[PDB]
Amino acid sequence: VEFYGPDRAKWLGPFSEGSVPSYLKGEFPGDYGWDTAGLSADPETFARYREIEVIHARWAMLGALGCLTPELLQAADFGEAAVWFKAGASIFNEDGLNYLGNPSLIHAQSIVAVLLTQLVIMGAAEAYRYSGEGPVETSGDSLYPGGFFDPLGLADDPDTLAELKVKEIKNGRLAMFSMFGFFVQGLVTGKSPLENLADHLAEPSVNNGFASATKFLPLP
Amino acid sequence: EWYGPNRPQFLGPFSNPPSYLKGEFPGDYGWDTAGLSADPETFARYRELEVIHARWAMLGALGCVTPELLQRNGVANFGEAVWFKAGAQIFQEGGLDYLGNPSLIHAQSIVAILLTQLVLMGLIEGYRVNGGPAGEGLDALYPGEAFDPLGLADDPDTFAELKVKELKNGRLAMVSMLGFGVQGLITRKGPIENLA
Amino acid sequence: EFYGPDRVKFLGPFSTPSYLKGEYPGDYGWDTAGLSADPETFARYRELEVIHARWAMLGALGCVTPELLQRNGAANFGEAVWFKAGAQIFQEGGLDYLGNPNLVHAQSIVAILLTQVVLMGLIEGYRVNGGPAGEVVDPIYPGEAFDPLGLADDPDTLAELKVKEIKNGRLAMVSMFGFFIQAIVTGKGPVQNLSDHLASPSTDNFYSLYAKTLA
Amino acid sequence: AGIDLPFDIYTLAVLNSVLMGXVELFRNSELDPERRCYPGGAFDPLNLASDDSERTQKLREAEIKHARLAMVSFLGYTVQAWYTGEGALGSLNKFANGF
Amino acid sequence: GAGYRQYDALWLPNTERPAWLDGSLPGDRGFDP
Amino acid sequence: SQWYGPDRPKFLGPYSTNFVPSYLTGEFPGDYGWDTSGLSADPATFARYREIEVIHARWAMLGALGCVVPELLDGTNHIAWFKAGAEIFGDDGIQYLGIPGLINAKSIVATLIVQVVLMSYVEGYRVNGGPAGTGLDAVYPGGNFDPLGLADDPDTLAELKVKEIKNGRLAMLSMFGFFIQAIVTGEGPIKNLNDHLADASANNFYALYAKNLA
Ligand code: CLA
Ligand SMILES: CC1=C[C@H](O)CC(C)(C)[C@H]1/C=C/C(C)=C/C=C/C(C)=C/C=C/C=C(C)/C=C/C=C(C)/C=C/C1=C(C)C[C@H](O)CC1(C)C
Ligand SMILES: CC1=C[C@H](O)CC(C)(C)[C@H]1/C=C/C(C)=C/C=C/C(C)=C/C=C/C=C(C)/C=C/C=C(C)/C=C/C1=C(C)C[C@H](O)CC1(C)C
Ligand SMILES: CC/C=C\C/C=C\C/C=C/CCCCCCCC(=O)O
């Protein structure tokens, strides 16, 4: 099924034809015709929203991978630092950040130093990204630089590039949905997502989302 | 310096302002990463909202910090010096005393305060929006005249400089007010107590 | 894929009779005994395959559902196991649907058999000749009154749905055969065997407790 | 509704017979076969389907479908009362508390 | 024009209306065996 | 007639004669000239916001009525609107009006699946059109949705539109009040009204809950 043109897949199946905006002509990756609030009726705002969505999708994929991998590797020992939201305070402990369990890799003890270093490096990186030009010879596209960040040369055929763009906006959107689920589960049940999956697999009839429903009830 | 293409941008040496941000209006640092102001009407409404919010933020910050500093300076004993605890004073048996003096206000009824503030604020807001006794055909953003008794902002250059100073001071005041709110929410204490 | 001359065959890259030209749904080019070398016999075999597929899908669902309901504490049937469910008519009160005494309360097997014979004969005569529910045009894909939701409207979607139906029916037939031979070997329920195997996959299987007892 | 009436059962029986007879004798007085089913007038105060249009036909279809459904439903009421010895809510309770 | 079939409806999918029932009456479904 | 044109009522009364946006001409119902945020400069976004507002108004009126009604009935134990969801986990399930044997809903996944399917179908029909009407208006279809023909005359239709949108806005405000008042007090709105009527001076917001809100 094609993902471009007037005969592309859409966000409501057979019912989509009645809610497709005029400005959503399917000229961009991930165009399913879903805009019911008219938030992208301005062409400039549409480009800004596309940029924000792509960046957020990439960061959400990174976050999902970095929340899933450390728990599986625990091949290592962390204890209370295995959980993704419980690893924030592991630096403040007087043992250091034992990367993979070895207390000799980074041995981080201070907060201000790492914080300031991250601020300066990512400020430089994000300022270069906003400028779009600098020390690296990119292709000139802010959203898809390619010149330096594609050492394998996977983006050479325009049609293959478009198909890859569709696939990775889709993977990014799935990552965004999963990250929102991770956040909500962390606030609600206070357990790691793998533990939640194990509890659900143990007995799915009673260990579902509606079991922890009355815990938010405001008592007088 | 503060106006035209020579103005500094919001990312230091890096400067990629949007097309619609020409810098004519005060406090234009080219920060529209969301693209919300692509329409002139929405941009103008956002400018008005920003300046009004800035003025209210500076006023609120001064009103939040002055009484608690005065209490901590050993001048007078307030009922509750903490800025986010001023509402509980009206429920005390002693009422609301200005600077602690029982002969100043001694307000007791919250309903009367609510009604009086509602009518007065509504009348002055309607005057500001439409034009009342304090001038009718004046600027909505900078009416001047009765609102500039000193006449400092008369010539264009000083007017623009003072407007830029107003906008940046108001932005700093808004950031400070948000910091006040977060600090109070987390620490459950006064701002100056956190400072010291 | 799934149609024309370049469709996927039944041996993947290791793969054909001349009469299997990639026109009919669910044609993977597996006819080694040459039983479908006659076009008329090919049509008859296709019709029997489709009917068997539908019947086997219904049978698999009806063999899984009551035992699944019973084992989860959702109902109390007289005999949840599928091969022992036919003896409920010889119990004290008879056959009660879902365990409720006020649902069917069947007691006589003769009446059941007579009514089933009459109704089944009438509807199968309608199927092969045409009756109240429509007139026969396509012997296995009537549509019209049997497709109220109109899912088989577009011809491309019709072909895709035909392929999906025939594949799910073939899988259902295989599972029906497995269910039969497991009943004739293990003597317990299908979901019971699944639960036992899931409890201890290494030690609970056909070879570990039944291979040596076969001979 | 739990309130004892001030009438005797003999008086009530005679009154019911007389009132029903009078009402049905009034109803029988019509002569137009169309108005024998849809009298209108005082029986259509809101003037919902008193003209000749598509709106009245839909209302008549709804009325006839509701009539048929209620007829079958009351036959079910009677047969359930005969068999199980319960009413309507009683039959619902007996069915629910049997699984 | 999606999610259903376009498809007078009688009491049987394939049946004919009787001669004396012309369909003018409201609930006329051609049902009089 | 008085609700349209340049002489319609404004949202700030006489203090908004000159504070009227250029694009809020007044050909749409409920046009009081309250757009002091510049959120509807684009006509397409304006139309989408109008549709969202009408749908929200209808949903809010339904929700307000359905939150008020069950609390006033003895059969349902005067249950609050925010506590009725967990009744499906009770030893008796959900029984309509308190009459046993009416619904007896004990499973939550079954009701969730049924609602998902039904709401999916009806929402798809609303967006694209279906058996209940094709080619009709997006927000005000009519036809099968106006069985009584209460809006045949266009003037009556406009007056009813203004009445509907106003009742919907009031219901939205009341539903937000319901949410906030359930969050703060922790009791049903009807009990709060009864407590206020019993002692207005004592039982209110400031006298009981505002003092310990910070
Ligand atoms: C806007 C959406 C909305 C939503 C989501 C809800 C949601 C809910 N309602 Mg509320 N409600 C609403 C609007 C809404 N309501 C409105 C507008 C009203 C006024 C009519 C009510 C009045 C109401 C009542 C009276 C009750 C609820 C209850 C319920 C709960 C489930 C019951 C159920 O769905 O019945 C399934 C679906 C139906 C359509 C049932 C209708 C058919 C019944 C069986 C007919 C009864 C009539 C019949 C003639 C018998 C009565 C005669 C009697 C004397 C014997 C649930 C919390 C029930 C509960 O117990 O909550 C605590 C309950 O008792 N609601
Ligand atoms: C720029 C841009 C651009 C792009 O495009 C996009 C984006 C990024 C989104 C954007 C951004 C934005 C932002 C950041 C904003 C912010 C804001 C704020 C913070 C405000 C505040 C604000 C704030 C404010 C007003 C405040 C106020 C306050 C007040 C009045 C107070 C008062 C008071 C007092 C005296 C004291 C007492 O005891 C109490 C009270 C009574 C309480
Ligand atoms: C105008 C303007 C202008 C300028 O320019 C700007 C601004 C200012 C921004 C604007 C404003 C706006 C606003 C104000 C808004 C609001 C809204 C709301 C509140 C809504 C609600 C809304 C609301 C709603 C829907 C609601 C709904 C509800 C519901 C369904 C409910 C349901 C239910 C019930 C029955 C009961 C049970 O037991 C439970 C449940 C199931 C839960
Ligand atoms: C046209 C009128 C025709 C017939 C009416 C005839 C009779 C009315 C019925 C009377 C019933 C009297 C029952 C007396 C005993 C009641 C039970 C008791 O109190 O023990």
Short mmCIF file of N, CA and C in Angstrom, two decimals, chain C residues 100-193:
data_model
loop_
_atom_site.label_atom_id
_atom_site.label_comp_id
_atom_site.label_asym_id
_atom_site.label_seq_id
_atom_site.Cartn_x
_atom_site.Cartn_y
_atom_site.Cartn_z
N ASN C 100 -27.49 -22.96 32.68
CA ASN C 100 -28.73 -22.39 33.20
C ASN C 100 -29.89 -23.34 32.94
N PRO C 101 -30.63 -23.76 33.97
CA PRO C 101 -31.76 -24.68 33.74
C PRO C 101 -32.88 -24.08 32.91
N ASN C 102 -32.94 -22.76 32.76
CA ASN C 102 -34.02 -22.10 32.04
C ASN C 102 -33.62 -21.66 30.64
N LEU C 103 -32.60 -22.28 30.04
CA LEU C 103 -32.11 -21.86 28.74
C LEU C 103 -32.54 -22.80 27.62
N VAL C 104 -32.18 -24.08 27.69
CA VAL C 104 -32.59 -25.02 26.65
C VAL C 104 -33.34 -26.18 27.28
N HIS C 105 -32.73 -26.82 28.28
CA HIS C 105 -33.35 -27.92 29.01
C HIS C 105 -33.75 -29.06 28.08
N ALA C 106 -32.88 -29.38 27.12
CA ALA C 106 -33.14 -30.49 26.21
C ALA C 106 -33.06 -31.81 26.96
N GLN C 107 -33.99 -32.72 26.64
CA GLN C 107 -34.07 -33.98 27.37
C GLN C 107 -34.08 -35.20 26.45
N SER C 108 -34.64 -35.06 25.26
CA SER C 108 -34.82 -36.19 24.35
C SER C 108 -33.83 -36.11 23.20
N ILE C 109 -33.11 -37.21 22.96
CA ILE C 109 -32.16 -37.24 21.86
C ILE C 109 -32.86 -37.52 20.54
N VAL C 110 -33.99 -38.23 20.57
CA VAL C 110 -34.72 -38.51 19.34
C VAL C 110 -35.26 -37.23 18.73
N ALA C 111 -35.85 -36.36 19.56
CA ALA C 111 -36.36 -35.09 19.06
C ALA C 111 -35.23 -34.22 18.52
N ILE C 112 -34.10 -34.19 19.23
CA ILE C 112 -32.94 -33.43 18.77
C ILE C 112 -32.52 -33.92 17.39
N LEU C 113 -32.40 -35.24 17.23
CA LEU C 113 -31.95 -35.80 15.96
C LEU C 113 -32.94 -35.50 14.84
N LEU C 114 -34.24 -35.65 15.10
CA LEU C 114 -35.24 -35.42 14.06
C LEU C 114 -35.23 -33.96 13.61
N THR C 115 -35.25 -33.03 14.57
CA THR C 115 -35.24 -31.62 14.21
C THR C 115 -33.97 -31.25 13.46
N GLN C 116 -32.82 -31.74 13.93
CA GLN C 116 -31.56 -31.44 13.26
C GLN C 116 -31.56 -31.98 11.83
N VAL C 117 -32.04 -33.20 11.64
CA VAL C 117 -32.07 -33.78 10.30
C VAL C 117 -32.94 -32.94 9.38
N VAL C 118 -34.14 -32.58 9.84
CA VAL C 118 -35.06 -31.83 8.99
C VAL C 118 -34.47 -30.47 8.63
N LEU C 119 -33.99 -29.73 9.63
CA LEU C 119 -33.48 -28.39 9.37
C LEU C 119 -32.23 -28.42 8.50
N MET C 120 -31.30 -29.34 8.80
CA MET C 120 -30.07 -29.43 8.02
C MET C 120 -30.36 -29.83 6.58
N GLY C 121 -31.26 -30.79 6.37
CA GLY C 121 -31.61 -31.16 5.01
C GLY C 121 -32.23 -30.01 4.25
N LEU C 122 -33.15 -29.28 4.89
CA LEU C 122 -33.78 -28.15 4.22
C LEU C 122 -32.76 -27.09 3.83
N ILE C 123 -31.87 -26.73 4.76
CA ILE C 123 -30.93 -25.65 4.45
C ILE C 123 -29.87 -26.09 3.46
N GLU C 124 -29.37 -27.32 3.52
CA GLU C 124 -28.40 -27.78 2.53
C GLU C 124 -29.02 -27.85 1.14
N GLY C 125 -30.44 -28.30 1.00
CA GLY C 125 -31.15 -28.21 -0.26
C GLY C 125 -31.27 -26.78 -0.76
N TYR C 126 -31.49 -25.84 0.16
CA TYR C 126 -31.50 -24.43 -0.21
C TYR C 126 -30.13 -24.00 -0.73
N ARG C 127 -29.06 -24.47 -0.08
CA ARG C 127 -27.71 -24.09 -0.51
C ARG C 127 -27.42 -24.58 -1.92
N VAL C 128 -27.80 -25.82 -2.23
CA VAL C 128 -27.48 -26.37 -3.55
C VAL C 128 -28.49 -26.00 -4.63
N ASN C 129 -29.64 -25.43 -4.26
CA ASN C 129 -30.67 -25.14 -5.25
C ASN C 129 -31.11 -23.68 -5.22
N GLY C 130 -31.08 -23.06 -4.04
CA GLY C 130 -31.58 -21.71 -3.89
C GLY C 130 -32.95 -21.70 -3.23
N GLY C 131 -33.14 -20.83 -2.25
CA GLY C 131 -34.38 -20.79 -1.51
C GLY C 131 -34.69 -19.43 -0.92
N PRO C 132 -35.19 -19.42 0.32
CA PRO C 132 -35.61 -18.16 0.93
C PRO C 132 -34.50 -17.13 1.07
N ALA C 133 -33.27 -17.56 1.30
CA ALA C 133 -32.17 -16.63 1.57
C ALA C 133 -31.48 -16.15 0.30
N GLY C 134 -31.93 -16.57 -0.87
CA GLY C 134 -31.36 -16.08 -2.11
C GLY C 134 -31.40 -17.15 -3.18
N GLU C 135 -30.88 -16.78 -4.34
CA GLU C 135 -30.80 -17.66 -5.50
C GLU C 135 -29.34 -17.96 -5.80
N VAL C 136 -29.06 -19.22 -6.13
CA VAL C 136 -27.68 -19.66 -6.29
C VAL C 136 -27.11 -19.10 -7.58
N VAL C 137 -25.97 -18.41 -7.47
CA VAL C 137 -25.22 -17.95 -8.63
C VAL C 137 -23.80 -18.47 -8.51
N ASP C 138 -23.14 -18.15 -7.40
CA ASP C 138 -21.85 -18.71 -7.07
C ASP C 138 -22.05 -19.81 -6.03
N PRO C 139 -21.69 -21.06 -6.32
CA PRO C 139 -22.05 -22.15 -5.41
C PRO C 139 -21.43 -22.06 -4.02
N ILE C 140 -20.34 -21.31 -3.85
CA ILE C 140 -19.68 -21.21 -2.55
C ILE C 140 -19.52 -19.78 -2.06
N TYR C 141 -19.77 -18.78 -2.89
CA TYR C 141 -19.66 -17.37 -2.50
C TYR C 141 -20.92 -16.63 -2.92
N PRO C 142 -22.03 -16.85 -2.21
CA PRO C 142 -23.30 -16.21 -2.60
C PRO C 142 -23.28 -14.70 -2.47
N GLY C 143 -22.90 -14.20 -1.30
CA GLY C 143 -22.97 -12.77 -1.07
C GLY C 143 -24.41 -12.32 -0.87
N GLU C 144 -24.66 -11.06 -1.22
CA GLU C 144 -25.99 -10.47 -1.16
C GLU C 144 -26.57 -10.55 0.25
N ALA C 145 -27.39 -11.58 0.50
CA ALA C 145 -28.01 -11.76 1.81
C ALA C 145 -27.07 -12.37 2.83
N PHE C 146 -25.97 -12.99 2.40
CA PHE C 146 -24.99 -13.57 3.30
C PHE C 146 -23.80 -12.65 3.54
N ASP C 147 -23.81 -11.45 2.97
CA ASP C 147 -22.79 -10.44 3.21
C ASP C 147 -23.48 -9.12 3.53
N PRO C 148 -24.11 -9.02 4.71
CA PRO C 148 -24.85 -7.79 5.02
C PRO C 148 -23.95 -6.59 5.24
N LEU C 149 -22.81 -6.78 5.91
CA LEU C 149 -21.91 -5.67 6.19
C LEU C 149 -21.18 -5.18 4.94
N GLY C 150 -21.26 -5.90 3.83
CA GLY C 150 -20.65 -5.47 2.59
C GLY C 150 -19.14 -5.39 2.62
N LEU C 151 -18.49 -6.34 3.29
CA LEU C 151 -17.03 -6.36 3.31
C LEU C 151 -16.44 -6.86 1.99
N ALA C 152 -17.15 -7.74 1.30
CA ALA C 152 -16.70 -8.26 0.01
C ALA C 152 -17.33 -7.46 -1.14
N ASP C 153 -17.08 -6.15 -1.11
CA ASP C 153 -17.58 -5.26 -2.15
C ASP C 153 -16.54 -5.05 -3.25
N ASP C 154 -15.37 -4.55 -2.89
CA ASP C 154 -14.31 -4.35 -3.86
C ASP C 154 -13.75 -5.70 -4.30
N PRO C 155 -13.57 -5.94 -5.60
CA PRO C 155 -13.04 -7.24 -6.04
C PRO C 155 -11.66 -7.56 -5.48
N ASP C 156 -10.78 -6.56 -5.34
CA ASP C 156 -9.47 -6.81 -4.77
C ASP C 156 -9.58 -7.25 -3.32
N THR C 157 -10.40 -6.54 -2.54
CA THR C 157 -10.66 -6.95 -1.17
C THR C 157 -11.34 -8.31 -1.12
N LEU C 158 -12.19 -8.60 -2.11
CA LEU C 158 -12.83 -9.91 -2.17
C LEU C 158 -11.80 -11.02 -2.34
N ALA C 159 -10.84 -10.83 -3.24
CA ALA C 159 -9.79 -11.83 -3.44
C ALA C 159 -8.92 -11.98 -2.20
N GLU C 160 -8.55 -10.86 -1.58
CA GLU C 160 -7.74 -10.94 -0.36
C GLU C 160 -8.48 -11.69 0.74
N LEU C 161 -9.78 -11.40 0.91
CA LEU C 161 -10.56 -12.08 1.94
C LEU C 161 -10.73 -13.56 1.62
N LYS C 162 -10.86 -13.91 0.34
CA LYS C 162 -10.93 -15.32 -0.03
C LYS C 162 -9.66 -16.05 0.35
N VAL C 163 -8.50 -15.44 0.06
CA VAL C 163 -7.23 -16.06 0.43
C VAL C 163 -7.13 -16.22 1.94
N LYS C 164 -7.50 -15.18 2.69
CA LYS C 164 -7.44 -15.25 4.14
C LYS C 164 -8.36 -16.33 4.69
N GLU C 165 -9.62 -16.45 4.15
CA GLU C 165 -10.57 -17.47 4.57
C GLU C 165 -10.01 -18.86 4.35
N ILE C 166 -9.44 -19.08 3.15
CA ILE C 166 -8.98 -20.43 2.83
C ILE C 166 -7.78 -20.81 3.69
N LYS C 167 -6.89 -19.85 3.96
CA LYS C 167 -5.73 -20.17 4.80
C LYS C 167 -6.14 -20.43 6.24
N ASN C 168 -6.99 -19.55 6.89
CA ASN C 168 -7.46 -19.79 8.25
C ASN C 168 -8.21 -21.11 8.34
N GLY C 169 -9.03 -21.53 7.19
CA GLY C 169 -9.73 -22.80 7.19
C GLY C 169 -8.79 -23.99 7.14
N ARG C 170 -7.71 -23.88 6.36
CA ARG C 170 -6.72 -24.95 6.33
C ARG C 170 -6.07 -25.13 7.70
N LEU C 171 -5.70 -24.02 8.35
CA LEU C 171 -5.15 -24.12 9.69
C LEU C 171 -6.15 -24.73 10.66
N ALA C 172 -7.43 -24.38 10.52
CA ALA C 172 -8.47 -24.94 11.38
C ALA C 172 -8.63 -26.44 11.15
N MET C 173 -8.54 -26.89 9.90
CA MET C 173 -8.61 -28.32 9.62
C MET C 173 -7.45 -29.06 10.27
N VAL C 174 -6.24 -28.50 10.17
CA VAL C 174 -5.08 -29.14 10.79
C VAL C 174 -5.27 -29.23 12.30
N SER C 175 -5.75 -28.14 12.92
CA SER C 175 -5.97 -28.16 14.36
C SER C 175 -7.09 -29.12 14.75
N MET C 176 -8.11 -29.27 13.90
CA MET C 176 -9.16 -30.25 14.16
C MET C 176 -8.60 -31.67 14.17
N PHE C 177 -7.76 -31.98 13.19
CA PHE C 177 -7.13 -33.30 13.16
C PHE C 177 -6.27 -33.52 14.40
N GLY C 178 -5.50 -32.50 14.78
CA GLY C 178 -4.70 -32.61 15.99
C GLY C 178 -5.54 -32.82 17.23
N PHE C 179 -6.67 -32.12 17.33
CA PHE C 179 -7.56 -32.27 18.47
C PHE C 179 -8.11 -33.69 18.53
N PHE C 180 -8.52 -34.23 17.38
CA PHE C 180 -9.04 -35.59 17.33
C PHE C 180 -7.98 -36.59 17.79
N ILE C 181 -6.83 -36.58 17.25
CA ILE C 181 -5.84 -37.59 17.60
C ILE C 181 -5.33 -37.40 19.03
N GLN C 182 -5.26 -36.16 19.53
CA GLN C 182 -4.93 -35.96 20.94
C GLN C 182 -5.98 -36.59 21.84
N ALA C 183 -7.37 -36.36 21.53
CA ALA C 183 -8.47 -36.98 22.27
C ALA C 183 -8.37 -38.50 22.22
N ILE C 184 -8.00 -39.05 21.06
CA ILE C 184 -7.89 -40.50 20.95
C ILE C 184 -6.64 -41.04 21.63
N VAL C 185 -5.68 -40.18 21.96
CA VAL C 185 -4.43 -40.59 22.59
C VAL C 185 -4.39 -40.18 24.07
N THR C 186 -4.46 -38.88 24.35
CA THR C 186 -4.34 -38.42 25.73
C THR C 186 -5.60 -38.71 26.53
N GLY C 187 -6.77 -38.47 25.94
CA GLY C 187 -8.02 -38.68 26.64
C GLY C 187 -8.49 -37.52 27.49
N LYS C 188 -7.84 -36.36 27.40
CA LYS C 188 -8.22 -35.18 28.16
C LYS C 188 -8.52 -34.03 27.21
N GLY C 189 -8.91 -32.89 27.78
CA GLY C 189 -9.29 -31.74 27.01
C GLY C 189 -8.12 -31.09 26.29
N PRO C 190 -8.41 -30.38 25.20
CA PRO C 190 -7.34 -29.71 24.44
C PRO C 190 -6.65 -28.60 25.22
N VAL C 191 -7.44 -27.70 25.80
CA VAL C 191 -6.86 -26.63 26.61
C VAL C 191 -6.21 -27.22 27.86
N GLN C 192 -6.71 -28.35 28.35
CA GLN C 192 -6.04 -29.04 29.44
C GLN C 192 -4.64 -29.49 29.04
N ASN C 193 -4.50 -30.04 27.83
CA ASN C 193 -3.18 -30.41 27.33
C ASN C 193 -2.29 -29.19 27.17
#
